[PDB]
Subunit: 216 residues, 4 copies
């Protein structure tokens, strides 16, 4: 089911400080290689009155390349697929909850995302759009409650210098029982490859890979 080259389609319904929007996208990648790209477009509520960056990481777990000896949980879940949940805790008080459903369709992945962002200060980096993409990150994963959980200490680069910090807490839930891995790490690097002027059309590229701690 999981071919060496695959594509997906995504749809997102979001709310950021009372502001509604919807996004639609299409992406594709190399599941076994840990590469993926997606092209999104704001189909409703655009142009966004906030930093696109907070939405970026919400657009593909099946493409994480894993070592032989680390169970490939998300993949294994195929083809019934899995669900994903997330909490984003911003240093200035901003809180985001995300819920996503991942399926297989006609050979194509289908991502459905729900997103709620609240408590972002009107003058902060998200509402004032002062962010300039994320630094590359390392997620710490572990099995818990019969599912796969992971946390990341991420940071957005600030247009005028410095960083705006965000802690990610995520939950990966196979739709059918599948083998869980142990304590591991996932290195990621997401880049906004291009976008129109008002961020109503954006393209991203993500490089992501699973592994053990270097000192092991």
């Amino acid at each position: 089911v999981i071919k060496e080259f695959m594509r997906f389609k995504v749809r997102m319904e979001g709310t950021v400080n009372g502001h509604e929007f919807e996004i639609e996208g299409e992406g594709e990648g190399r599941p076994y290689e840990g590469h993926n790209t997606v092209k999104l477009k704001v189909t409703k509520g655009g142009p966004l009155p906030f930093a696109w960056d907070i939405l970026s990481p919400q657009f593909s777990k099946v493409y994480v390349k894993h070592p032989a000896d680390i169970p490939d949980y998300m993949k294994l879940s195929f083809p019934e697929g899995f669900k994903w949940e997330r909490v984003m805790n911003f240093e200035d008080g901003g809180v985001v909850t995300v819920t996503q459903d991942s399926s297989l369709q006609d050979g194509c992945f289908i991502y459905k995302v729900k997103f709620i962002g609240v408590n972002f200060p009107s003058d902060g980096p998200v509402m004032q759009k002062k962010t300039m993409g994320w630094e590359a990150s390392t997620e710490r994963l572990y099995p818990r409650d019969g599912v796969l959980k992971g946390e990341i200490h991420k940071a957005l680069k600030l247009k005028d210098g410095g960083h705006y910090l965000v802690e990610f807490k995520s939950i990966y839930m196979a739709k059918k029982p599948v083998q869980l891995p142990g304590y591991y790490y996932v290195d990621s690097k997401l880049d906004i490859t291009s976008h129109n002027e008002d961020y109503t059309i954006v393209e991203q590229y993500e490089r992501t890979e699973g592994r053990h701690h270097l000192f092991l």
Copy 2:
């Protein structure tokens, strides 16, 4: 616009640990008296596989009775009305984000709610339904970022003894500039007055009042 006896209608679209649902309700109360009731019904995704209690507080700020000398922010916002946002931080890791829109229609209030609950342990009190209503609470309010903010240290009563703690962080945003109050408190008491067997039809009653700290 704000008559001494009013009614409202509510609709909620929610997600709890991957589980979708929709609720519809109708309530009514005495805005100046700080009393309100609502009757809800699960119109989609029922019966809920989780504690109804976590949804309860999401079903009416305009009914808070305020003292003469404390600006009545939510009321004042009428009739354009206001928006409300919330974060619920559960002691076991559960996180909920809520976004709500409040309007005036034909003399009737209209509440629209979006809700995302994630990271609730499968064996915890929410997913296992071991809760038995909330204790009465005291919210600490203050003006910030040109809006009204409030926090509460709440607790759900556990069927078998003890409490499950939840911290509420809320943001109230007038749709038009209106007078903000200073540092104050709001005492609340929400009761599930009745419900069918599978919590698909529920009725609540809430008593809520604004005030200054007792020692002032």
Copy 3:
């Protein structure tokens, strides 16, 4: 043991962002009335390079006046007395942990405090001394783990307007088993009554009382 008028002595060893200090004090009050005062003096590391306010609440649980029907936990612990622990979570990242021992001596209470404050931004309100006392507060108490626990959403008044928020989490531990109360509240009001120029000599007055939620 707990006379209607009593006095205590206190000593504190603290650290705030790498800065050591010691304080010594003497206070006295009316345990049954919920009033107490203390006079402190910086005996080491003064004058403090930070806001005195963060130290204030660390200087007397036995003086909380309680209603007849609410067990008087701290008092009951007498005369073996009890221990108290606390976490202070500041909105800008500042974190404080406090550990205190309370005893009875020759008819006089004896408070011993250890205090560690870290992660306070160099330009924030604590390190820049922009605070102007606390607003009056309401602590939410409950029995847990065989002890008494309480949380408060507190706020320091800012010299130039606005508030700096702090969440208190405290643990009260009787040195001998004594009767615990249920879910209750404690209203407090602490005032810096006077102080020398460089805050090396300060006097505070605290009014504190236990009670049930108003709507009960």
Copy 4:
């Protein structure tokens, strides 16, 4: 000042849920190689009624091996040295604040540590000693407030399976202005190499190295 082989001495005064203790130790290592060992002994309040593991990471930043192009902040601070501060946030509510002073003496490093642990559930893994060492970790570092800050998502291995999670937040402060680095990572692996029966005498070995994100 920083020879290729150096040794240090450490002393710690701590408090864990009302329990006092003091530790003294001696260690030594290869600063440029990122290796260090220390041998500790409980000199006061032993045997500890809690998991030794929570104390372990508190016993040597100067030994982190850094790449050529990543400023060696802690080292550079020599010989005036630096201070370090930390917050440890345990998933079950446990909170620890630590403050440490690092100096150079007669060619030997001198570490002074203050430690306050509070809110650990009586039946949790720390108070019941169910931990079995830490997994290896990755700290995310960045310059902020003119100092070096870092966060880690760490985990203690549980004797009977599973993990107990802890988030570390640390602050590194050069005693004299020195060059700060940018956004980087530090991989660590701390092992309890041996200990007596009642953890009153323990030896640890730590391997730690600085680097850039793999995908850079």
